[PDB]
Design a protein around this ligand. Structure first.
Ligand SMILES: *[C@@H]1O[C@H](CO)[C@@H](O)[C@H](O)[C@H]1NC(C)=O
Ligand SMILES: *[C@@H]1O[C@H](CO)[C@@H](O)[C@H](O)[C@H]1NC(C)=O
Lengths: 50, 49
């Protein structure tokens, strides 16, 4: 479940940070990065609580 | 090529058309062994797996 969750969109524009970095400038990719990091932190917290 | 975990594990060569395996490397949490500090200052280092 964790591994499958890893590759989710999380309401962002893409599921791979490598694409996000190369798509635009850091000022406009930091939002997507922040959304990814919040989602993944939420998932990790839930896994550890379980 | 993908495994159960939806992760790539084998990619065919676009150049000469061969099947190539991929495998991640160098995973581990560094751990240090010590017999306390009061009676010694020599330690032992362990690498995980
Ligand atoms: C790839 O190009 C090389 C260079 O000409 C050739 O020797 C080889 O047969 C080619 N492989 C293909 C087209 O699958
Ligand atoms: C260290 O070992 C000596 C020898 O027994 C003892 O006198 C001393 O109280 C010890 N110190 C600590 C901090 O354990």
């Amino acid at each position: 479940t964790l591994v499958k969750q890893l590759s989710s969109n999380f309401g962002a524009i893409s599921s791979v940070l490598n694409d996000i970095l190369a798509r635009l400038d850091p000022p406009e990719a930091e939002v997507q990065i922040d959304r990814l990091i919040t989602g993944r932190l939420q998932s990790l917290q839930t896994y550890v609580t379980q | 090529g993908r495994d159960i975990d939806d992760t790539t594990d084998a990619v065919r060569d676009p150049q000469t058309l061969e099947i190539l395996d991929i495998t991640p490397c160098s995973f581990g949490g560094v751990s240090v062994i010590t017999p306390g500090t009061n009676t010694s200052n020599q330690v032992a280092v362990l690498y995980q797996g």
